Symmetry: C2
Subunit: 218 residues, 2 copies
Protein backbone atom coordinates (compact mmCIF):
# COMPACT_ATOMS: atom_id res chain seq x y z
CA UNK A 1 0.00 0.00 0.00
CA UNK A 2 2.67 2.46 -1.18
CA UNK A 3 1.22 6.01 -1.69
CA UNK A 4 -0.45 6.12 -5.10
CA UNK A 5 -1.17 9.41 -6.87
CA UNK A 6 -3.75 9.62 -9.68
CA UNK A 7 -3.58 12.89 -11.61
CA UNK A 8 -6.53 13.81 -13.85
CA UNK A 9 -5.48 16.03 -16.71
CA UNK A 10 -5.55 16.68 -20.42
CA UNK A 11 -1.77 16.76 -20.31
CA UNK A 12 -0.61 13.48 -18.80
CA UNK A 13 2.93 13.69 -20.28
CA UNK A 14 3.65 16.70 -18.07
CA UNK A 15 3.09 14.52 -15.05
CA UNK A 16 5.09 11.58 -16.40
CA UNK A 17 7.86 13.91 -17.15
CA UNK A 18 8.10 15.50 -13.73
CA UNK A 19 8.19 12.01 -12.14
CA UNK A 20 11.38 11.13 -13.99
CA UNK A 21 13.65 13.45 -12.05
CA UNK A 22 14.60 14.47 -8.56
CA UNK A 23 12.77 13.35 -5.43
CA UNK A 24 9.61 12.12 -7.07
CA UNK A 25 11.73 9.76 -9.20
CA UNK A 26 13.72 8.77 -6.13
CA UNK A 27 10.48 8.15 -4.21
CA UNK A 28 9.09 5.95 -7.03
CA UNK A 29 12.35 4.08 -7.46
CA UNK A 30 12.30 3.27 -3.74
CA UNK A 31 8.72 2.03 -3.90
CA UNK A 32 7.44 4.80 -1.62
CA UNK A 33 5.17 6.50 -4.17
CA UNK A 34 3.50 5.80 -7.47
CA UNK A 35 2.13 8.43 -9.87
CA UNK A 36 -0.58 7.64 -12.38
CA UNK A 37 -1.40 10.28 -14.95
CA UNK A 38 -4.99 9.72 -16.07
CA UNK A 39 -5.72 11.30 -19.43
CA UNK A 40 -9.13 13.00 -19.32
CA UNK A 41 -9.40 12.60 -23.03
CA UNK A 42 -9.43 8.81 -22.82
CA UNK A 43 -12.66 9.18 -20.89
CA UNK A 44 -14.28 11.50 -23.29
CA UNK A 45 -16.06 11.22 -26.58
CA UNK A 46 -14.51 13.43 -29.23
CA UNK A 47 -12.06 14.66 -26.63
CA UNK A 48 -14.76 17.27 -26.09
CA UNK A 49 -13.75 17.30 -22.38
CA UNK A 50 -14.90 20.86 -22.03
CA UNK A 51 -17.96 22.72 -23.22
CA UNK A 52 -19.54 26.12 -23.26
CA UNK A 53 -20.82 26.98 -19.80
CA UNK A 54 -24.30 28.15 -19.01
CA UNK A 55 -25.56 31.60 -18.23
CA UNK A 56 -23.28 32.88 -20.94
CA UNK A 57 -19.62 33.05 -20.00
CA UNK A 58 -16.54 33.77 -22.13
CA UNK A 59 -14.90 30.38 -22.29
CA UNK A 60 -15.31 26.72 -21.65
CA UNK A 61 -15.75 24.51 -18.59
CA UNK A 62 -14.71 20.93 -17.87
CA UNK A 63 -17.60 18.54 -18.23
CA UNK A 64 -18.91 16.27 -15.47
CA UNK A 65 -18.92 12.96 -17.43
CA UNK A 66 -15.18 12.36 -18.17
CA UNK A 67 -14.14 13.36 -14.66
CA UNK A 68 -16.79 11.07 -13.11
CA UNK A 69 -15.86 8.31 -15.51
CA UNK A 70 -12.17 8.62 -14.66
CA UNK A 71 -13.12 8.71 -10.96
CA UNK A 72 -15.04 5.40 -11.34
CA UNK A 73 -12.14 3.88 -13.27
CA UNK A 74 -9.83 4.69 -10.39
CA UNK A 75 -12.18 3.49 -7.64
CA UNK A 76 -12.58 0.24 -9.57
CA UNK A 77 -9.00 -0.49 -10.56
CA UNK A 78 -7.43 0.86 -7.40
CA UNK A 79 -9.16 1.76 -4.18
CA UNK A 80 -11.45 4.69 -3.43
CA UNK A 81 -9.16 7.71 -3.62
CA UNK A 82 -9.08 10.82 -1.46
CA UNK A 83 -10.18 13.42 -4.07
CA UNK A 84 -8.24 16.69 -4.32
CA UNK A 85 -8.94 19.45 -6.84
CA UNK A 86 -6.55 22.13 -8.12
CA UNK A 87 -8.32 24.97 -9.90
CA UNK A 88 -6.64 27.47 -12.28
CA UNK A 89 -6.63 30.14 -9.52
CA UNK A 90 -5.99 27.93 -6.47
CA UNK A 91 -2.50 27.42 -5.14
CA UNK A 92 -2.13 28.04 -1.42
CA UNK A 93 -1.13 24.91 0.50
CA UNK A 94 1.12 24.67 3.55
CA UNK A 95 3.24 21.97 5.26
CA UNK A 96 0.14 21.02 7.25
CA UNK A 97 -1.76 19.64 4.25
CA UNK A 98 1.32 18.08 2.80
CA UNK A 99 1.89 16.16 6.04
CA UNK A 100 -1.80 15.27 6.25
CA UNK A 101 -1.74 13.98 2.72
CA UNK A 102 1.52 12.14 3.28
CA UNK A 103 -0.33 9.92 5.72
CA UNK A 104 -2.83 8.79 3.02
CA UNK A 105 -2.77 5.82 0.65
CA UNK A 106 -4.62 6.96 -2.49
CA UNK A 107 -4.90 10.40 -3.98
CA UNK A 108 -6.78 11.65 -6.97
CA UNK A 109 -5.84 15.15 -8.08
CA UNK A 110 -8.17 16.76 -10.53
CA UNK A 111 -6.34 19.46 -12.51
CA UNK A 112 -8.74 22.26 -13.15
CA UNK A 113 -8.63 24.20 -16.43
CA UNK A 114 -10.37 26.99 -18.25
CA UNK A 115 -13.29 28.58 -16.42
CA UNK A 116 -13.16 25.76 -13.84
CA UNK A 117 -14.91 22.44 -13.25
CA UNK A 118 -18.70 21.81 -13.26
CA UNK A 119 -19.90 21.98 -9.66
CA UNK A 120 -21.57 18.60 -9.89
CA UNK A 121 -18.04 17.16 -9.63
CA UNK A 122 -17.64 18.65 -6.13
CA UNK A 123 -19.81 15.83 -4.82
CA UNK A 124 -16.78 13.55 -5.04
CA UNK A 125 -14.26 16.23 -4.06
CA UNK A 126 -12.73 15.80 -0.62
CA UNK A 127 -10.60 18.89 -0.62
CA UNK A 128 -10.10 21.98 -2.73
CA UNK A 129 -6.76 23.90 -2.81
CA UNK A 130 -7.91 27.38 -1.69
CA UNK A 131 -7.32 30.50 -3.77
CA UNK A 132 -3.77 31.68 -4.05
CA UNK A 133 -3.05 35.19 -5.30
CA UNK A 134 -2.01 34.68 -8.93
CA UNK A 135 -3.47 32.99 -11.98
CA UNK A 136 -2.26 29.91 -13.78
CA UNK A 137 -3.87 28.33 -16.85
CA UNK A 138 -4.45 24.97 -15.20
CA UNK A 139 -3.92 22.79 -12.18
CA UNK A 140 -1.01 20.68 -13.34
CA UNK A 141 1.73 22.83 -11.69
CA UNK A 142 -0.09 22.68 -8.32
CA UNK A 143 -0.54 18.95 -8.70
CA UNK A 144 3.21 18.55 -9.17
CA UNK A 145 3.95 20.85 -6.22
CA UNK A 146 1.67 18.58 -4.16
CA UNK A 147 3.27 15.39 -5.44
CA UNK A 148 6.63 16.97 -4.82
CA UNK A 149 5.97 18.20 -1.29
CA UNK A 150 4.30 14.99 -0.22
CA UNK A 151 6.96 12.74 -1.76
CA UNK A 152 9.83 14.35 0.11
CA UNK A 153 8.13 14.06 3.53
CA UNK A 154 7.60 10.30 3.12
CA UNK A 155 9.85 8.11 5.24
CA UNK A 156 12.43 6.25 3.19
CA UNK A 157 12.80 8.87 0.48
CA UNK A 158 14.73 11.59 2.16
CA UNK A 159 17.95 10.37 3.61
CA UNK A 160 18.35 12.89 6.31
CA UNK A 161 16.85 16.24 5.39
CA UNK A 162 20.49 31.65 7.03
CA UNK A 163 22.88 31.83 4.03
CA UNK A 164 24.79 28.78 2.80
CA UNK A 165 28.17 28.39 1.08
CA UNK A 166 30.07 25.73 -0.77
CA UNK A 167 33.48 24.48 -1.73
CA UNK A 168 34.88 27.13 -3.94
CA UNK A 169 36.59 28.88 -1.00
CA UNK A 170 37.08 32.03 -3.04
CA UNK A 171 35.45 32.79 -6.42
CA UNK A 172 35.50 35.93 -8.60
CA UNK A 173 37.11 37.49 -5.56
CA UNK A 174 34.14 36.60 -3.37
CA UNK A 175 35.28 34.68 -0.31
CA UNK A 176 33.40 32.42 2.03
CA UNK A 177 32.98 33.77 5.55
CA UNK A 178 36.11 32.66 7.41
CA UNK A 179 33.76 31.80 10.26
CA UNK A 180 32.33 28.82 8.39
CA UNK A 181 35.88 27.51 7.56
CA UNK A 182 37.65 26.57 10.73
CA UNK A 183 35.56 25.72 13.68
CA UNK A 184 36.28 23.50 16.63
CA UNK A 185 37.09 26.85 18.06
CA UNK A 186 33.97 27.84 16.15
CA UNK A 187 31.45 25.24 17.46
CA UNK A 188 29.66 28.15 19.09
CA UNK A 189 30.96 30.78 16.71
CA UNK A 190 29.57 28.99 13.62
CA UNK A 191 26.40 29.08 15.61
CA UNK A 192 26.85 32.82 15.83
CA UNK A 193 26.74 33.32 12.08
CA UNK A 194 23.81 30.92 12.12
CA UNK A 195 21.69 33.26 14.24
CA UNK A 196 23.30 36.65 13.69
CA UNK A 197 22.17 36.21 10.08
CA UNK A 198 19.42 33.60 10.23
CA UNK A 199 16.93 36.29 11.40
CA UNK A 200 17.91 39.10 9.05
CA UNK A 201 16.70 37.07 6.07
CA UNK A 202 13.49 36.11 7.98
CA UNK A 203 12.17 39.65 8.52
CA UNK A 204 13.39 40.61 5.06
CA UNK A 205 11.55 38.38 2.52
CA UNK A 206 11.58 41.30 -0.06
CA UNK A 207 12.50 44.84 0.92
CA UNK A 208 10.27 47.87 1.12
CA UNK A 209 7.96 48.06 -2.03
CA UNK A 210 4.66 46.65 -0.82
CA UNK A 211 5.84 46.75 2.73
CA UNK A 212 4.80 50.39 2.88
CA UNK A 213 1.20 49.51 1.94
CA UNK A 214 0.78 46.44 4.13
CA UNK A 215 2.57 47.63 7.26
CA UNK A 216 0.81 50.92 6.61
CA UNK A 217 -2.70 49.79 7.48
CA UNK A 218 -1.95 47.02 9.98
CA UNK B 1 9.11 40.36 -30.61
CA UNK B 2 9.16 38.02 -27.86
CA UNK B 3 9.62 37.86 -24.04
CA UNK B 4 12.54 35.45 -23.45
CA UNK B 5 13.01 33.17 -20.41
CA UNK B 6 16.23 31.49 -19.37
CA UNK B 7 15.79 28.72 -16.82
CA UNK B 8 18.90 27.55 -14.95
CA UNK B 9 18.32 24.03 -13.76
CA UNK B 10 19.86 20.60 -13.46
CA UNK B 11 16.56 19.23 -14.86
CA UNK B 12 16.25 20.97 -18.24
CA UNK B 13 13.74 18.42 -19.57
CA UNK B 14 11.18 19.33 -16.96
CA UNK B 15 11.07 22.81 -18.48
CA UNK B 16 11.15 21.65 -22.08
CA UNK B 17 8.37 19.18 -21.32
CA UNK B 18 6.03 21.84 -19.82
CA UNK B 19 6.54 24.13 -22.84
CA UNK B 20 5.01 21.69 -25.24
CA UNK B 21 1.49 22.12 -23.97
CA UNK B 22 -1.09 24.60 -22.92
CA UNK B 23 -0.70 28.34 -22.94
CA UNK B 24 3.06 28.23 -22.85
CA UNK B 25 3.10 26.34 -26.13
CA UNK B 26 0.59 28.74 -27.63
CA UNK B 27 2.68 31.73 -26.54
CA UNK B 28 5.73 30.04 -28.04
CA UNK B 29 3.76 29.13 -31.10
CA UNK B 30 2.64 32.73 -31.61
CA UNK B 31 6.12 34.14 -31.06
CA UNK B 32 5.16 35.96 -27.85
CA UNK B 33 7.54 34.00 -25.74
CA UNK B 34 10.58 31.85 -25.81
CA UNK B 35 11.75 29.50 -23.08
CA UNK B 36 15.34 28.46 -22.98
CA UNK B 37 16.12 25.70 -20.48
CA UNK B 38 19.81 26.03 -19.52
CA UNK B 39 21.43 22.89 -18.25
CA UNK B 40 23.62 23.73 -15.23
CA UNK B 41 25.71 20.71 -15.84
CA UNK B 42 26.86 21.94 -19.29
CA UNK B 43 28.24 24.97 -17.57
CA UNK B 44 30.01 23.32 -14.71
CA UNK B 45 33.72 24.17 -15.16
CA UNK B 46 35.34 21.20 -13.32
CA UNK B 47 32.10 19.20 -14.10
CA UNK B 48 30.74 19.73 -10.54
CA UNK B 49 27.36 21.48 -9.97
CA UNK B 50 26.80 20.91 -6.21
CA UNK B 51 29.18 20.39 -3.30
CA UNK B 52 29.31 20.09 0.48
CA UNK B 53 28.58 23.34 2.31
CA UNK B 54 30.77 24.86 5.02
CA UNK B 55 30.02 25.15 8.70
CA UNK B 56 29.08 21.48 8.53
CA UNK B 57 25.53 21.01 7.29
CA UNK B 58 23.62 17.88 6.26
CA UNK B 59 23.67 17.99 2.48
CA UNK B 60 24.78 19.84 -0.58
CA UNK B 61 24.50 23.35 -1.90
CA UNK B 62 24.60 24.55 -5.51
CA UNK B 63 27.96 25.96 -6.45
CA UNK B 64 28.60 29.49 -7.74
CA UNK B 65 30.76 28.81 -10.78
CA UNK B 66 28.23 27.09 -13.03
CA UNK B 67 25.49 29.59 -12.31
CA UNK B 68 27.88 32.52 -12.93
CA UNK B 69 29.09 30.87 -16.13
CA UNK B 70 25.49 30.32 -17.25
CA UNK B 71 24.64 33.95 -16.41
CA UNK B 72 27.68 35.15 -18.38
CA UNK B 73 26.63 33.09 -21.39
CA UNK B 74 23.11 34.58 -21.30
CA UNK B 75 24.52 38.11 -21.03
CA UNK B 76 26.90 37.64 -24.01
CA UNK B 77 24.45 35.79 -26.29
CA UNK B 78 21.11 37.41 -25.53
CA UNK B 79 21.39 40.43 -23.32
CA UNK B 80 21.51 40.98 -19.61
CA UNK B 81 18.62 39.34 -17.86
CA UNK B 82 16.49 40.45 -14.99
CA UNK B 83 17.50 37.72 -12.56
CA UNK B 84 14.95 35.81 -10.54
CA UNK B 85 15.69 32.98 -8.07
CA UNK B 86 13.22 30.48 -6.73
CA UNK B 87 14.57 28.62 -3.70
CA UNK B 88 13.43 25.09 -2.66
CA UNK B 89 11.35 26.79 0.05
CA UNK B 90 10.18 29.83 -1.94
CA UNK B 91 6.72 30.01 -3.52
CA UNK B 92 4.67 33.10 -2.74
CA UNK B 93 4.32 35.41 -5.79
CA UNK B 94 1.22 37.38 -6.90
CA UNK B 95 -0.61 38.86 -9.90
CA UNK B 96 1.38 41.93 -9.01
CA UNK B 97 4.74 40.46 -10.00
CA UNK B 98 3.27 38.43 -12.83
CA UNK B 99 2.31 41.70 -14.51
CA UNK B 100 5.58 43.53 -13.75
CA UNK B 101 7.45 40.51 -15.15
CA UNK B 102 5.31 40.47 -18.30
CA UNK B 103 6.62 43.94 -19.09
CA UNK B 104 10.18 42.60 -19.21
CA UNK B 105 12.23 41.40 -22.17
CA UNK B 106 14.67 38.99 -20.57
CA UNK B 107 14.23 36.91 -17.46
CA UNK B 108 16.60 34.35 -16.08
CA UNK B 109 15.27 32.12 -13.33
CA UNK B 110 17.80 30.27 -11.21
CA UNK B 111 16.15 27.08 -9.94
CA UNK B 112 17.25 26.25 -6.40
CA UNK B 113 18.05 22.77 -5.08
CA UNK B 114 19.33 20.94 -2.01
CA UNK B 115 20.33 23.14 0.92
CA UNK B 116 20.24 26.14 -1.41
CA UNK B 117 22.49 28.26 -3.56
CA UNK B 118 25.84 29.60 -2.56
CA UNK B 119 25.04 33.10 -1.32
CA UNK B 120 27.58 34.71 -3.65
CA UNK B 121 25.14 34.11 -6.48
CA UNK B 122 22.93 36.70 -4.86
CA UNK B 123 25.07 39.51 -6.28
CA UNK B 124 23.51 39.04 -9.70
CA UNK B 125 20.03 38.14 -8.44
CA UNK B 126 17.51 40.94 -8.78
CA UNK B 127 14.52 39.37 -7.11
CA UNK B 128 13.88 36.48 -4.78
CA UNK B 129 10.60 34.56 -4.57
CA UNK B 130 9.83 34.81 -0.83
CA UNK B 131 9.17 31.84 1.47
CA UNK B 132 5.78 30.21 0.91
CA UNK B 133 4.55 27.94 3.79
CA UNK B 134 5.47 24.56 2.27
CA UNK B 135 8.73 23.03 1.04
CA UNK B 136 9.67 21.78 -2.38
CA UNK B 137 12.72 19.80 -3.39
CA UNK B 138 13.56 22.36 -6.09
CA UNK B 139 12.65 25.59 -7.91
CA UNK B 140 11.59 24.01 -11.16
CA UNK B 141 7.89 24.02 -10.26
CA UNK B 142 8.06 27.68 -9.25
CA UNK B 143 9.85 28.56 -12.41
CA UNK B 144 7.13 26.93 -14.45
CA UNK B 145 4.40 28.69 -12.49
CA UNK B 146 6.15 31.97 -13.21
CA UNK B 147 6.47 31.12 -16.96
CA UNK B 148 2.81 30.05 -17.03
CA UNK B 149 1.42 33.07 -15.19
CA UNK B 150 3.38 35.59 -17.21
CA UNK B 151 2.66 33.95 -20.56
CA UNK B 152 -1.09 33.99 -20.06
CA UNK B 153 -1.26 37.77 -19.37
CA UNK B 154 0.79 38.55 -22.46
CA UNK B 155 -1.10 40.34 -25.21
CA UNK B 156 -1.79 38.05 -28.18
CA UNK B 157 -1.86 34.78 -26.18
CA UNK B 158 -5.29 34.50 -24.51
CA UNK B 159 -8.09 35.55 -26.96
CA UNK B 160 -9.39 38.49 -24.72
CA UNK B 161 -9.11 38.47 -21.02
CA UNK B 162 -19.15 31.15 -7.55
CA UNK B 163 -20.09 27.71 -8.87
CA UNK B 164 -20.04 26.92 -12.60
CA UNK B 165 -21.88 24.40 -14.78
CA UNK B 166 -21.67 23.00 -18.30
CA UNK B 167 -23.69 21.41 -21.14
CA UNK B 168 -24.81 18.10 -19.62
CA UNK B 169 -28.07 19.62 -18.30
CA UNK B 170 -28.76 16.61 -16.12
CA UNK B 171 -26.19 13.98 -15.18
CA UNK B 172 -26.35 11.04 -12.77
CA UNK B 173 -29.59 12.63 -11.54
CA UNK B 174 -27.70 15.84 -10.78
CA UNK B 175 -29.38 18.79 -12.51
CA UNK B 176 -28.12 22.27 -13.31
CA UNK B 177 -29.79 25.05 -11.33
CA UNK B 178 -32.74 25.81 -13.61
CA UNK B 179 -32.32 29.36 -12.51
CA UNK B 180 -29.10 29.79 -14.40
CA UNK B 181 -31.04 28.27 -17.11
CA UNK B 182 -33.41 30.49 -19.10
CA UNK B 183 -33.11 34.18 -18.25
CA UNK B 184 -34.00 37.49 -19.81
CA UNK B 185 -36.35 36.90 -17.13
CA UNK B 186 -33.06 35.95 -15.42
CA UNK B 187 -30.68 38.77 -16.50
CA UNK B 188 -30.82 39.84 -12.87
CA UNK B 189 -31.71 36.43 -11.48
CA UNK B 190 -28.62 34.80 -12.95
CA UNK B 191 -26.90 37.60 -11.08
CA UNK B 192 -28.52 36.38 -7.88
CA UNK B 193 -27.02 32.90 -7.83
CA UNK B 194 -23.95 34.82 -9.00
CA UNK B 195 -23.85 36.57 -5.65
CA UNK B 196 -26.09 34.57 -3.35
CA UNK B 197 -23.46 31.87 -3.87
CA UNK B 198 -20.37 33.95 -4.74
CA UNK B 199 -19.82 34.81 -1.06
CA UNK B 200 -20.41 31.45 0.59
CA UNK B 201 -17.49 29.81 -1.20
CA UNK B 202 -15.23 32.84 -0.41
CA UNK B 203 -15.51 32.78 3.42
CA UNK B 204 -15.39 28.95 3.25
CA UNK B 205 -12.00 28.08 1.67
CA UNK B 206 -12.03 24.93 3.69
CA UNK B 207 -14.16 24.17 6.73
CA UNK B 208 -13.65 23.94 10.53
CA UNK B 209 -10.16 22.25 10.60
CA UNK B 210 -7.57 24.97 11.06
CA UNK B 211 -9.88 27.78 12.06
CA UNK B 212 -9.95 26.77 15.71
CA UNK B 213 -6.14 26.65 15.95
CA UNK B 214 -5.56 29.83 13.92
CA UNK B 215 -8.64 32.09 14.02
CA UNK B 216 -8.41 32.08 17.81
CA UNK B 217 -4.62 32.43 17.95
CA UNK B 218 -4.99 36.05 16.87
Amino acid sequence: NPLRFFVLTIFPHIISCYSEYGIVKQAIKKGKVEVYPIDLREFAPKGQVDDVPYGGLPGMVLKPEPIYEAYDYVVENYGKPFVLITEPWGEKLNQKLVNELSKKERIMIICGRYEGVDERVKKIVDMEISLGDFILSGGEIVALAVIDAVSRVLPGVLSEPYPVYTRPREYRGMKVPEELLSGHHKLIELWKLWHRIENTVKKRPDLIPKDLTELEKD
